[PDB]
Design a protein around this ligand. Structure first.
Ligand SMILES: CCC1=C(C)/C(=C/C2=NC(=C\c3[nH]c(/C=C4\NC(=O)[C@H](C)[C@H]4CC)c(C)c3CCC(=O)O)/C(CCC(=O)O)=C2C)NC1=O
Ligand SMILES: CCC1=C(C)/C(=C/C2=NC(=C\c3[nH]c(/C=C4\NC(=O)[C@H](C)[C@H]4CC)c(C)c3CCC(=O)O)/C(CCC(=O)O)=C2C)NC1=O
Ligand SMILES: CCC1=C(C)/C(=C/C2=NC(=C\c3[nH]c(/C=C4\NC(=O)[C@H](C)[C@H]4CC)c(C)c3CCC(=O)O)/C(CCC(=O)O)=C2C)NC1=O
Ligand SMILES: CCC1=C(C)/C(=C/C2=NC(=C\c3[nH]c(/C=C4\NC(=O)[C@H](C)[C@H]4CC)c(C)c3CCC(=O)O)/C(CCC(=O)O)=C2C)NC1=O
Ligand SMILES: CCC1=C(C)/C(=C/C2=NC(=C\c3[nH]c(/C=C4\NC(=O)[C@H](C)[C@H]4CC)c(C)c3CCC(=O)O)/C(CCC(=O)O)=C2C)NC1=O
Ligand SMILES: CCC1=C(C)/C(=C/C2=NC(=C\c3[nH]c(/C=C4\NC(=O)[C@H](C)[C@H]4CC)c(C)c3CCC(=O)O)/C(CCC(=O)O)=C2C)NC1=O
Ligand SMILES: CCC1=C(C)/C(=C/C2=NC(=C\c3[nH]c(/C=C4\NC(=O)[C@H](C)[C@H]4CC)c(C)c3CCC(=O)O)/C(CCC(=O)O)=C2C)NC1=O
Ligand SMILES: CCC1=C(C)/C(=C/C2=NC(=C\c3[nH]c(/C=C4\NC(=O)[C@H](C)[C@H]4CC)c(C)c3CCC(=O)O)/C(CCC(=O)O)=C2C)NC1=O
Ligand SMILES: CCC1=C(C)/C(=C/C2=NC(=C\c3[nH]c(/C=C4\NC(=O)[C@H](C)[C@H]4CC)c(C)c3CCC(=O)O)/C(CCC(=O)O)=C2C)NC1=O
Ligand SMILES: CCC1=C(C)/C(=C/C2=NC(=C\c3[nH]c(/C=C4\NC(=O)[C@H](C)[C@H]4CC)c(C)c3CCC(=O)O)/C(CCC(=O)O)=C2C)NC1=O
Ligand SMILES: CCC1=C(C)/C(=C/C2=NC(=C\c3[nH]c(/C=C4\NC(=O)[C@H](C)[C@H]4CC)c(C)c3CCC(=O)O)/C(CCC(=O)O)=C2C)NC1=O
Lengths: 50, 172, 162, 289, 172, 172, 172, 162, 162
């Protein structure tokens, strides 16, 4: 699909004439998980609710 | 990549001075005839695929050894490869006359056309004659007006003629 | 290049193994095919001129308009008839190579790769060669394992053609 | 005098001792030396009888005119201009005159100025005279011996360069010098002014990667910058060149002949990949580290 | 890639005519001896790895400078590389005698064997002598029948001898 | 350059040992059949030029596009060039069967035959078919005895057949 | 061609200005040690041929596969070719240390040493090790004074060491 | 590139011999020349601006017409004076390189190769630069072996110039 | 590569002619030589170890000093004896190849090209191998045309050696 010289890409994200084809991978996969968020303690809430 | 505006920019940056007034008058002439660039590119892109078939027609009426078995254009796969080669050659001619600079055609065909054609065993003579006949047919469909408002087009004729001879001496 | 010996070699190359007994059985099957395929190619080469001649005449009677209207694909004058008969002779020769090679490789490489593309850009119709191959597979008149192996190759060309 | 893979380099046909014209040669011995002069100066181009120049040749068969002057006579002739001066580029004509008369490839850019400068100042008729009236000419074959390729022997005065530049100049024995892969273009004139040499390739069949030619746009130097710092592999790197890549097709492969730079640790896997593309290997030379 | 059937097909397509009857008789002879191709390939693939060790045995009894430090086959890594080279060489010999055409061995070894061996500094003389001794041992295990039904096998002997000499003049 | 005696010498020098006895028995067989090498070389050199004309005859009856204007063999100069190519090809076949080794033909034709033929635009298919027909005619004149004392000649038939197929896959 | 004086001239001409005073002081140091350039060149040219034989001695004690038949340095002709290669390599080292600039050695050996050695099949490893041992022996005969008036010679030692490593990474 | 070390190397290259004792004497002679040539180049570089300025003014007084008539070679306006003074400064810088190189090579390569040809196609006169070099060799005012070695280089440029 | 078949081929190549009857006579002469040359090479290969052993011992008794003085060419210790015996074995093997090839080509290419040059740079003496070949030609003890053809090859090596 790419070869020697070709930069990779998302192959066939949006099928033609689809309004919403596909989610791009750079958003869909972050570089943390749902697990290192717990190690850092990043969901300290701003307490906007209640 | 390189447009004639960017050609003037690269000359003026290699000199490193501001652009001369007469060169800007030449660019004023260019933007005055940009609609004729549009006229020509539209005309030959309208008829491009039929031009490719007619060029292969004259080539295969001329040299029957290519159709003959053992010939380089003999097989169905290689025949589609031939029409692929001619179609993308005419495509880069249309790119060059749309840009106005031969740098696109040179930098994306001059490099490896001769190389692939000697490495595969492709006879460069047939491609040279075919791109010459294709260029003659392209000038034939570009120059004659069919319901088009009249004007002079000799500079464009010279331009695509130069582009097709650069293609012809590219493949040889 | 569909040859069961060479396909076995390509498989064992991709595995990186030595020759296995599967390949020995593959060779056995190739010999079993060839033991009638060679004689079938012989009688096909004997019949070939009458085959392509009857096939061209049958396609001309099958559609009268290709003889009728002046066109570039069609056989209005005799040069188009020559190119048409050259094409069916090419087809039958590919069938003979396909038979003698033990696989669809000569057919695949020499016809199937871009046949519909040149039919598109020349405005040919593949159904002409379809009914031509139907006349050939009706005309060869053979019996046995060789007949149906050839018929299998012919309808493979028909299916990939349409 | 190679004798190891002499088949591979094509110089096995040029093995024989040079031809020497005797003091009283016979008519047949004359004709052999004339055939040798025609074959060497026109580069294994065969000659028709209408272009045979039998008149200038008969004067040589007398003995009043020397062999070296007969070499001068065929190079002064209009057929040599029409075959070589006329179709080729003038720098390429200088390149051809180095093979045809001196018998070796040019060594630097100084010789190509001297012969271009001389061409503009005095003409092709004078330029040919300057090739033949040379100490480098007269040492190797004074009056009697035919020109012949001396580049395969060191001959006490060869720079290294001419050995490898000669294989860009001539291919094989069967190849006629008017008729090469590049055709009109000059191989060495790119090589001279950068003062660099391309890898030696042998001629076909014996070697099947002969098809490879370096692109004019892309130099692809041999060393590749740092023993592959950027390729990030601990082992040394070799240059690899492929001749065709035809299996891959048009949308996958833009140009059949390319140069790869690989470490030896990944060499085996890339060679297997090239063979999977049906590509045959032209040259492989150690690149860096 | 190229089989002897496909060899005949490629000749008949380069000529572009139907196959001759006598060539088809030759192919009838070939399919008559295909069981002997099976006999030979099975026999030498049965003993192949021991043949590789015996070839390295005679090579290392012959040239102790390779085992000697500073030699090209000295190190353990390079020794495994040696046995790798000989094993895949015998593997492509088995490929060629299974296919019947030397095109597999040529097109997958002739290209870069000499190239790697001059680029690395590998002495091609030792590989040439080793593939010669390996070919002699291969003919020795193929030809003699051990509980096998008797027949003539001179054509096969000629075939693998030719394959091993093509390997020997491949590496040189 | 390389004779079969010198072939044995170069093998025995690459090994660096004295020549084996069985190889010397093979050379005794060779010098026993040297008179048949003489018989064959004399026979086909007797008829060589007529063989060249008959090969060009079948080629030009087969492919009329070569004689047709614009064809590669069309012009009188190029026609003489064609007959030159075929004559020197048959000459090197006679050299090879006189020497007994294909090294002369390989090292003086294999190198640049394909090269000149792709560089000029020469269709290699016609030369391949022509050297095949020329080889068939050469076997036809060699094998049949006309007032010649009888004997077997199958090894010579195999030898010149191999030489002509090396020529055929040389030009392709 | 290029001397260190001409090196300074070419730098000062590429800048196009007059030469700096400190560079002229460096040249004053150079002409102050020109007699030591003479001392070293005379010393190693006195012993040069024996150095070549001792380098071939250590090479052929190290790698007996070269003397072994099938080796690249095996034959008498190739052995004389080896000694020719080493002698002219040491000759260009003497040229470079006489001139003071490595440009002579580079421009007359760097270009085609690697090229000839991969084209012939010459193992570049043996020439690299041999020129390294030859350079060690050359420093050994240059540095030690035998009845010579004493002085420091570390800059010259660095210079010929650099010249021999440029030779070693030239051939590799 | 007339440098006695490099000329010795080119000689021994043409002979194919090792370094002979003739080359050792050649090196001795080059050191003997340089031992005053470097100091002479130093004082020339010190004097160079006054030298080229006096040389330009002396050539302008030497021929009044080049200042007088409007022409393209001549210095009618100030740009021609700038190009003229650039040329004599080029000349004196070549003299300094010629001195420091030990031979006529910088002079030869950088001036002598085509000076009369550009004088022909630009309609210059070499006698202008001749009398300029005469003023320079009168103006440097040195004594000793270095003075006459420089004077030898200067009259070599004069002789090859005319 | 002095082989009368290949020399005939090289001659007809230089002439550009087809095979002449001179070459047929050349082939006849080569067969006439080989018809005893092969059997002579056979008995030489049978005798070869005793030949080189007696030749080495005879050269050692022929000059006692090469055994006596410690030197690099000479056989002071046993490694020099091994290299010496390797050299005479090389010589006799070249003689056998020279015999079986029908010409002096194996001798020429493999010895005669640079033998005196390596004898010069190693300070060997060719007379050692001369008297070695004299002992070999005295020791082979054959009769007939094969004996004197081998003796001719041996004294050719002697003459080119000295
Ligand atoms: C692609 C959809 C599209 C088209 C076709 C287009 C055409 C176009 N061609 C034009 C002018 C023109 N075009 C031409 C070109 C030609 N006349 C000739 O006689 C030659 C045969 C031919 C040149 C090959 C000339 C001569 C003029 C008028 C004067 C001039 O500008 O040179 C103009 C300027 C005013 C006009 O004439 O309508 C337009 C808009 N614009 C578009 O957006
Ligand atoms: C080995 C397999 C193989 C095949 C089959 C093949 C076919 C083939 N048929 C072609 C054209 C053609 N084919 C036809 C055929 C027809 N028109 C008719 O009346 C008939 C119904 C039909 C007869 C089948 C015609 C008339 C042309 C030329 C189209 C035209 O004249 O512009 C062309 C274009 C080149 C040319 O002849 O002028 C190819 C490549 N090529 C191959 O390599
Ligand atoms: C002036 C600069 C210059 C250099 C340096 C040069 C080298 C040079 N070395 C060569 C050969 C050679 N060089 C060697 C070298 C060696 N033997 C080995 O096995 C070792 C690895 C190494 C021992 C030192 C050998 C054996 C040959 C002969 C190769 C052959 O016969 O093909 C050849 C081939 C020509 C010949 O047969 O003599 C050239 C042109 N040429 C030049 O013009
Ligand atoms: C000793 C080994 C050797 C060989 C074999 C050899 C071949 C050779 N064949 C050539 C040409 C040729 N070969 C042909 C061949 C053919 N005509 C066709 O169309 C057919 C496909 C084929 C008929 C047999 C033709 C027409 C030319 C002339 C090509 C041209 O005019 O450019 C040329 C170009 C020079 C010339 O004009 O004569 C060479 C050098 N040269 C050698 O040194
Ligand atoms: C974007 C610029 C660009 C160009 C122009 C290009 C050309 C190109 N043309 C090719 C083949 C080809 N080109 C031809 C050409 C011809 N047939 C003949 O016999 C005539 C002489 C000529 C008819 C026009 C043929 C037959 C092939 C297939 C060759 C083969 O099968 O090996 C190939 C080999 C890959 C393939 O099989 O499709 C490339 C890469 N590639 C590029 O990236
Ligand atoms: C499928 C076809 C194919 C072949 C045949 C092939 C050979 C091949 N042999 C190699 C190495 C080798 N080959 C040898 C060979 C030998 N040792 C000696 O000294 C003897 C002369 C000989 C003993 C048999 C050695 C030692 C190496 C390792 C060289 C190194 O370490 O640089 C390498 C270098 C990569 C590695 O380190 O493994 C390749 C790519 N590659 C391929 O893709
Ligand atoms: C891999 C599992 C497997 C094996 C072994 C196999 C073997 C096999 N070898 C056979 C024949 C044969 N195979 C040989 C081959 C040989 N005989 C000799 O004397 C030579 C030493 C040797 C050739 C190297 C011969 C001579 C025949 C019988 C006549 C012939 O076909 O040539 C046959 C035909 C009938 C028979 O004899 O059984 C079979 C089935 N089939 C298989 O599926
Ligand atoms: C050039 C002038 C010349 C010729 C012709 C020549 C021929 C010649 N061919 C001979 C033998 C022979 N030559 C042949 C060869 C053949 N017989 C056949 O049936 C095949 C058709 C043909 C091989 C293509 C055979 C079979 C023998 C006898 C037994 C043998 O040696 O094989 C012999 C040995 C004794 C004899 O039969 O006279 C001579 C002298 N010598 C010469 O100086
Ligand atoms: C070729 C015929 C010839 C020779 C030999 C020659 C030699 C020579 N070497 C000299 C100085 C010298 N040469 C050396 C060089 C060395 N001393 C060492 O301790 C190192 C081992 C060695 C450098 C590798 C030194 C250190 C001096 C004196 C101080 C200096 O100039 O560095 C001098 C200056 C005065 C003197 O000492 O005699 C001469 C003339 N001139 C000639 O025409
Ligand atoms: C490193 C050595 C070197 C030298 C000496 C050199 C000289 C040189 N002087 C030139 C022109 C010129 N030279 C002059 C000089 C003069 N007219 C006068 O009034 C004076 C008498 C004389 C002052 C010497 C003039 C006026 C031009 C420009 C000619 C014109 O304007 O068309 C040109 C033509 C290019 C140009 O300036 O416009 C060159 C190349 N180039 C070199 O590379
Ligand atoms: C195929 C033909 C062929 C021959 C003959 C040949 C000879 C040959 N003998 C050599 C050395 C030698 N040769 C001798 C020989 C002798 N000193 C003695 O005591 C004896 C009188 C004499 C025995 C003949 C010695 C002692 C050396 C090594 C010189 C030394 O040790 O430095 C060398 C230098 C390389 C080396 O061994 O170490 C060669 C190339 N090479 C060849 O390729």
């Amino acid at each position: 699909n790419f070869g020697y010289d070709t930069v990779p890409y998302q192959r066939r994200r949006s099928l033609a004439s689809r309004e919403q084809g596909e989610i791009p991978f750079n958003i869909k996969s972050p570089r943390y998980d749902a697990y290192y968020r717990s190690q850092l303690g990043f969901p300290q809430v701003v307490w906007q609710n209640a | 990549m390189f447009d004639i505006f960017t050609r003037v920019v690269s000359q003026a940056d290699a000199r490193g001075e501001f652009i001369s007034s007469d060169k800007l008058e030449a660019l004023k002439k260019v933007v005055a005839e940009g609609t004729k660039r549009s006229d020509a590119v539209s005309r030959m892109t309208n008829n491009a695929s039929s031009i490719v078939t007619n060029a292969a027609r004259q080539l295969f009426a001329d040299q029957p050894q290519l159709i003959a078995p053992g010939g380089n254009a003999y097989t169905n796969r290689r025949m589609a490869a031939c029409l692929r080669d001619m179609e993308i050659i005419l495509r880069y001619v249309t790119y060059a006359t749309f840009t106005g600079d031969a740098s696109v055609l040179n930098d994306r065909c001059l490099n490896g056309l001769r190389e692939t054609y000697v490495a595969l065993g492709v006879p460069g003579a047939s491609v040279a004659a075919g791109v010459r006949a294709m260029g003659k047919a392209a000038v034939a469909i570009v120059m004659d007006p069919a319901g088009v408002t009249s004007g002079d087009c000799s500079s464009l004729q010279q331009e695509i003629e130069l582009y097709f001879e650069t293609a012809a001496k590219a493949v040889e | 290049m569909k040859t069961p010996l060479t396909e076995a070699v390509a498989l064992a190359d991709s595995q990186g193994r030595f020759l296995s007994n599967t390949e020995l059985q593959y060779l056995y099957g190739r010999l079993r095919q060839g033991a009638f395929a060679l004689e079938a190619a012989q009688t096909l080469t004997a019949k070939a001129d009458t085959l392509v001649n009857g096939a061209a005449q049958a396609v001309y009677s099958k559609f009268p308009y290709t003889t009728s209207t002046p066109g570039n694909n069609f056989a209005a004058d005799q040069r188009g008839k020559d190119k048409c008969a050259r094409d069916i002779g090419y087809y039958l020769r590919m069938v003979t190579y396909c038979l003698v090679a033990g696989g669809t490789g000569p057919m695949d490489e020499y016809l199937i790769a871009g046949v519909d593309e040149i039919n598109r850009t020349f405005d040919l119709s593949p159904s002409w060669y379809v009914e031509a191959l139907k006349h050939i597979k009706a005309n060869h008149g053979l019996t046995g394992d060789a007949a149906t192996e050839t018929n299998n190759y012919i309808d493979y060309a028909i299916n990939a053609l349409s | 005098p190679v004798t190891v893979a002499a088949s591979r380099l094509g110089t096995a046909a040029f093995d024989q001792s040079p031809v020497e014209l005797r003091a009283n040669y016979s008519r047949d011995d004359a004709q052999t030396v004339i055939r040798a002069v025609y074959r060497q100066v026109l580069g294994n181009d065969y000659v028709m009888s209408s272009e045979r120049l039998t008149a200038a040749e008969s004067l040589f068969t007398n003995g009043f005119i020397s062999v070296r002057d007969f070499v001068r006579a065929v190079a002064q002739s209009e057929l040599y201009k029409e075959k070589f001066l006329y179709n080729n580029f003038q720098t390429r004509v200088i390149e051809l005159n180095f093979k045809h008369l001196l018998g070796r490839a040019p060594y630097d850019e100084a010789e190509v100025i001297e012969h271009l400068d001389r061409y503009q100042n005095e003409g092709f008729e004078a330029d040919i005279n300057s090739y033949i009236d040379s100490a480098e000419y007269t040492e190797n074959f004074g009056d009697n011996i035919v020109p012949y390729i001396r580049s395969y022997v060191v001959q006490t005065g060869h720079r290294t360069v001419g050995f490898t530049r000669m294989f860009s100049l001539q291919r094989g024995y069967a190849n006629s010098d008017r008729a090469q892969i590049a055709g009109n273009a000059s191989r060495l004139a790119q090589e001279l002014a950068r003062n660099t040499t391309s890898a030696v390739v042998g001629p076909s069949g014996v070697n099947e990667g002969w098809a490879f030619r370096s692109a004019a746009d892309d130099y692809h130097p041999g060393q590749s910058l740092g023993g592959s710092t950027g390729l990030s592999a601990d082992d040394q790197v070799v240059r690899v060149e492929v001749a065709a890549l035809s299996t891959p097709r048009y949308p996958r492969i833009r140009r059949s002949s390319r140069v790869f730079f690989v470490p030896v640790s990944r060499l085996s896997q890339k060679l297997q990949e090239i063979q999977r593309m049906g590509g045959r290997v032209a040259s492989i030379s150690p690149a860096g580290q």
